[PDB]
Scaffold this motif. Structure first.
Motif, PDB file in Angstrom:
ATOM      1  N   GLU A 150       0.860  -1.172   0.000  1.00 35.87           N
ATOM      2  CA  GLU A 150       0.000   0.000   0.000  1.00 35.87           C
ATOM      3  C   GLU A 150       0.900   1.227   0.000  1.00 35.87           C
ATOM      4  O   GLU A 150       0.782   2.087  -0.866  1.00 35.87           O
ATOM      5  N   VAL A 151       1.814   1.283   0.965  1.00 35.23           N
ATOM      6  CA  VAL A 151       2.753   2.390   1.090  1.00 35.23           C
ATOM      7  C   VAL A 151       3.588   2.489  -0.188  1.00 35.23           C
ATOM      8  O   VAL A 151       3.771   3.569  -0.753  1.00 35.23           O
ATOM      9  N   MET A 152       4.085   1.344  -0.638  1.00 39.14           N
ATOM     10  CA  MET A 152       4.915   1.276  -1.836  1.00 39.14           C
ATOM     11  C   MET A 152       4.203   1.905  -3.011  1.00 39.14           C
ATOM     12  O   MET A 152       4.826   2.574  -3.837  1.00 39.14           O
ATOM     13  N   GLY A 153       2.896   1.683  -3.077  1.00 38.50           N
ATOM     14  CA  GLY A 153       2.114   2.240  -4.158  1.00 38.50           C
ATOM     15  C   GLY A 153       1.836   1.265  -5.275  1.00 38.50           C
ATOM     16  O   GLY A 153       1.780   1.637  -6.445  1.00 38.50           O
ATOM     17  N   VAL A 154       1.681   0.000  -4.918  1.00 40.24           N
ATOM     18  CA  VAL A 154       1.370  -1.009  -5.909  1.00 40.24           C
ATOM     19  C   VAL A 154      -0.077  -0.740  -6.295  1.00 40.24           C
ATOM     20  O   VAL A 154      -0.922  -0.530  -5.431  1.00 40.24           O
ATOM     21  N   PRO A 155      -0.375  -0.698  -7.596  1.00 39.60           N
ATOM     22  CA  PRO A 155      -1.740  -0.461  -8.072  1.00 39.60           C
ATOM     23  C   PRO A 155      -2.740  -1.492  -7.507  1.00 39.60           C
ATOM     24  O   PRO A 155      -2.387  -2.293  -6.640  1.00 39.60           O
ATOM     25  N   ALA A 156      -3.982  -1.473  -7.990  1.00 39.04           N
ATOM     26  CA  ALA A 156      -4.999  -2.407  -7.504  1.00 39.04           C
ATOM     27  C   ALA A 156      -5.070  -3.652  -8.377  1.00 39.04           C
ATOM     28  O   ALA A 156      -5.509  -4.713  -7.928  1.00 39.04           O
ATOM     29  N   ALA A 157      -4.643  -3.510  -9.628  1.00 34.69           N
ATOM     30  CA  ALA A 157      -4.637  -4.621 -10.567  1.00 34.69           C
ATOM     31  C   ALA A 157      -3.339  -5.387 -10.374  1.00 34.69           C
ATOM     32  O   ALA A 157      -3.230  -6.558 -10.738  1.00 34.69           O
ATOM     33  N   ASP A 158      -2.353  -4.708  -9.796  1.00 29.31           N
ATOM     34  CA  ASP A 158      -1.047  -5.302  -9.529  1.00 29.31           C
ATOM     35  C   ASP A 158      -1.032  -5.905  -8.132  1.00 29.31           C
ATOM     36  O   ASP A 158      -0.138  -6.669  -7.783  1.00 29.31           O
ATOM     37  N   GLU A 160      -2.191  -8.338  -6.828  1.00 30.53           N
ATOM     38  CA  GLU A 160      -2.064  -9.781  -6.669  1.00 30.53           C
ATOM     39  C   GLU A 160      -0.776 -10.381  -7.232  1.00 30.53           C
ATOM     40  O   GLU A 160      -0.352 -11.443  -6.795  1.00 30.53           O
ATOM     41  N   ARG A 161      -0.151  -9.710  -8.194  1.00 31.20           N
ATOM     42  CA  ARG A 161       1.097 -10.215  -8.759  1.00 31.20           C
ATOM     43  C   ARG A 161       2.177 -10.010  -7.706  1.00 31.20           C
ATOM     44  O   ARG A 161       2.829 -10.954  -7.254  1.00 31.20           O
ATOM     45  N   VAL A 162       2.356  -8.744  -7.341  1.00 29.10           N
ATOM     46  CA  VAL A 162       3.352  -8.346  -6.365  1.00 29.10           C
ATOM     47  C   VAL A 162       3.293  -9.218  -5.115  1.00 29.10           C
ATOM     48  O   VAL A 162       4.312  -9.775  -4.703  1.00 29.10           O
ATOM     49  N   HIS A 163       2.119  -9.353  -4.506  1.00 31.03           N
ATOM     50  CA  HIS A 163       2.025 -10.198  -3.320  1.00 31.03           C
ATOM     51  C   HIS A 163       2.576 -11.587  -3.656  1.00 31.03           C
ATOM     52  O   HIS A 163       3.532 -12.061  -3.052  1.00 31.03           O
ATOM     53  N   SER A 164       1.967 -12.222  -4.646  1.00 26.61           N
ATOM     54  CA  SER A 164       2.363 -13.550  -5.078  1.00 26.61           C
ATOM     55  C   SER A 164       3.864 -13.659  -5.368  1.00 26.61           C
ATOM     56  O   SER A 164       4.435 -14.742  -5.286  1.00 26.61           O
ATOM     57  N   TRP A 165       4.510 -12.553  -5.715  1.00 28.28           N
ATOM     58  CA  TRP A 165       5.949 -12.597  -5.972  1.00 28.28           C
ATOM     59  C   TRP A 165       6.732 -12.428  -4.684  1.00 28.28           C
ATOM     60  O   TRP A 165       7.871 -12.872  -4.586  1.00 28.28           O
ATOM     61  N   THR A 166       6.131 -11.761  -3.705  1.00 30.70           N
ATOM     62  CA  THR A 166       6.803 -11.549  -2.434  1.00 30.70           C
ATOM     63  C   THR A 166       6.903 -12.887  -1.707  1.00 30.70           C
ATOM     64  O   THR A 166       6.631 -12.997  -0.515  1.00 30.70           O
ATOM     65  N   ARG A 167       7.283 -13.912  -2.465  1.00 32.08           N
ATOM     66  CA  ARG A 167       7.468 -15.258  -1.942  1.00 32.08           C
ATOM     67  C   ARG A 167       8.947 -15.581  -1.983  1.00 32.08           C
ATOM     68  O   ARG A 167       9.343 -16.687  -2.340  1.00 32.08           O
TER      69      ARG A 167
END
Ligand code: HEM
Ligand code: HEM
Lengths: 397, 388
Positions: A150-158, A160-167
């Motif tokens: 949220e702070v980083m500023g990841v969009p709303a369509a992004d 789910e990608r970003v989270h899934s990559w934060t693996r």
């Protein structure tokens, strides 16, 4: 001088302080240790004052550390352009400038509400599915991430990608080439992002950064190195709070306090913070830039030095009865977030996520307790940050 | 550099083939698609032979996908020799011999359901009244659910979440049913019988598969029914709107096997491809270097429309010579219920066409909506009417 000491990468099965560290501590203010990887040995400051002081002396460079083979705790070591970790003034300062705004106290007070909303959804789920649930994978992990994205500023369509990559965090290690593509994804995405977002307002971290690259104030090739860590950072809250919970959940004396008088968890959360052995050894070192007399000991130029905040936090001079958890300490000036201009960039944001986790989890999960025996909780092995591998808990349903 | 194509979900409202896939098939034997949720792109084989090979070539594992982006004991994510050990364990309650055997009971259960609709009268939704309830019952017989555990296992197993509804609720049914299965396997640990459960526990009681894997091996199966509930649901659909079909069917019973085959090959059973396969050793296809670690998908659907194999691919013949369609997969990862679903399908079509004399759709074709946001495709309901 005293003979060099070997400090193996031991895996404690619990929140147990490092015994070998405990040893080096009572061996003297300074000691020479040899870590698992990298050549040679390295200095080690165990005393509070020396540590705070070493970490604040301009005569200690952190950039040079990227060019040497300092005895280290990690197998591989690949510093990247833009990383605050190896930033040295004026550099460092220039960099943090581009993102600092997002982690300020005012910046975090404004997030609390949206971060609370986030946490609430997560709680909404385990509550609704029923008691047998792993707080680590259902709350403690997907949460610091989301809040940070949220702070980083990841969009709303992004979203789910970003989270899934934060693996990259993973349970332990998805695999050598496993989290590889994953870290290759996030980082790619980030460049892609930053490249757009050039010239644009929004305190949004990717916006500020991408606008800074616009003005060339932190130009690319530094981007994915600066934001990289900030994005993955939630990982630390996920393990530290995992430990706060673990102690609370296995030491009824602590849970008692935490519960018999909430709105007082303020110093208690500070106590946990100081006492918990966050990482498995010592982090990055600092290179002595010009013969320093650290605590009556001539450290030559070129020599590397480490600091153990963990041990620092146990200094009997500063913390009377250091090994006892107190939850009610005086000012307790612990150093969990580091020191010097390399102090934790997310400390304030981390605290907010910590204050939401503990408060909210203790609130909505009535009579929260372990669903298995204490010996059933496994701990992360072979990794920088120490922590429970899972947390099966139950609660009045 | 085949520019990665984008293959969105599918908000298809009908039995229509997927046009995006129709397009993907024209580019060539090999293409690069990008599926909705998920990070990155994957390959896709569309021609019959290639799919009837990628699926039958050691160098493409399934368990690897498990360490990428399943529960311990899922035939889906299985390689060798674990696929056997696991499949063998429960593979006998699904054989042609085990099915021909079950047939009478299945035919009885169905007749029961039919009795009910006949009594009440003409306006009825075959879906929620026959097509859906039937498979569960019949599969539960196969699975060996104790007659007392009917209203409960059948309950839980209904975490198919019709179109939607309780995604965090279906997790409770999934924890209890799976819990329930774990118990049924603990007991029966020294049992015997077709009853998949007892038969599992038996091997479990001999560590030929060990617990844990149990709940995951029978997990799908227990739930497996719905697939039949929607595939036939479609078969009927095409019968109740495409008359030439229903005519062939009614005027030539005894010869519905071919027709049932053609129907199987045509119907687009899912919204898209299933799990993928990882190129274990970095192979190639038609002068195309497939890097190891890269994911690859195969469409049996597209594979079933191959002009080379099925001349005039899109036409619904019902009399197609052999018609070696691939509706049940290929390679060891071939459907375990294939034979069980064939018998059920035939009992459904046959029974319904006799018991519901002059079966007719009671509403306009455009009044029959379809499932949305789900892996398998099918009608949401089927209002029919018959001679009362
Ligand atoms: C409460 C959990 C956390 C703890 C205990 C913690 C602790 C630390 C420590 C000890 C350091 C190194 C200090 C040194 O080099 O002397 C550090 C650095 C850092 N931390 Fe954290 N941290 C936490 C959470 C976070 C979070 C949530 C973020 C951002 C999402 C974050 C971002 C950073 C960054 C960017 C640095 C590098 C700072 C620099 O070198 O300038 N930390 N942290
Ligand atoms: C006529 C309705 C059905 C159709 C069209 C169908 C189709 C398919 C297809 C295309 C696959 C692909 C396998 C792969 O490539 O991984 C599959 C797998 C599977 N099906 Fe079905 N199925 C049907 C009914 C059922 C039923 C009723 C059951 C349970 C009794 C079932 C159980 C399975 C299982 C367990 C697999 C995984 C096989 C493996 O990977 O070894 N199916 N099915």
């Amino acid at each position: 001088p005293p003979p060099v000491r070997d400090w193996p990468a031991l895996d404690l099965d619990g929140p147990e302080f490092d015994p070998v560290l405990a040893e080096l501590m009572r061996e003297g203010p300074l000691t020479r240790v040899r870590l698992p990887h990298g050549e040679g040995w390295a200095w080690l400051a165990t005393r509070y004052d020396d540590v705070k002081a070493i970490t604040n002396d301009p005569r200690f460079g952190r950039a040079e550390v990227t060019q040497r083979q300092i005895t280290r705790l990690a197998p591989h070591f690949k510093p990247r352009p833009g990383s605050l970790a190896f930033a040295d003034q004026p550099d460092h300062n220039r960099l943090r400038r581009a993102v600092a705004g997002a982690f300020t106290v005012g910046a975090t007070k404004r997030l609390r509400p949206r971060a609370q909303e986030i946490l609430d959804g997560l709680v909404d789920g385990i509550l609704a599915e029923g008691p047998p649930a792993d707080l680590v994978e259902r709350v403690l992990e997907p949460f610091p991430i989301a809040v940070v994205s949220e702070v980083m500023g990841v969009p709303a369509a992004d979203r789910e990608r970003v989270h899934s990559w934060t693996r990259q965090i993973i349970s332990t290690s998805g695999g050598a080439e496993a989290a590889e593509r994953a870290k290759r994804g996030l980082y790619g995405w980030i460049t892609e992002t930053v490249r757009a977002r050039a010239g644009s307002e929004g305190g949004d971290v990717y916006s500020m950064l991408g606008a800074a690259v616009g003005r060339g104030e932190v130009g690319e090739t530094e981007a994915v190195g600066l934001a990289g860590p900030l994005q993955i950072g939630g990982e630390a809250v996920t393990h530290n709070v995992g430990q706060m919970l673990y102690l609370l959940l296995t030491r009824r004396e602590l849970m008692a306090r935490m519960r018999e008088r909430p709105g007082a968890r303020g110093t208690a959360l500070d106590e946990l913070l100081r006492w918990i052995s966050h990482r498995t050894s010592v982090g990055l070192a600092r290179i002595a830039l010009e013969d320093v007399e650290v605590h009556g000991t001539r450290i030559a130029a070129g020599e590397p030095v480490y600091v153990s905040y963990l041990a620092a936090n146990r200094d009997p001079d500063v913390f009377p009865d250091p090994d006892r958890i107190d939850l009610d300490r005086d000012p307790n000036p612990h150093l969990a977030y580091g020191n010097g201009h390399h102090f934790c960039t997310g400390a304030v944001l981390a605290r907010m996520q910590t204050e939401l986790l503990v408060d909210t989890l203790l609130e909505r999960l009535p009579g929260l307790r372990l669903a298995v025996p204490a010996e059933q909780v496994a701990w992360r092995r072979k990794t920088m940050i120490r922590g429970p591998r899972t947390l099966p808990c139950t609660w009045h349903h």
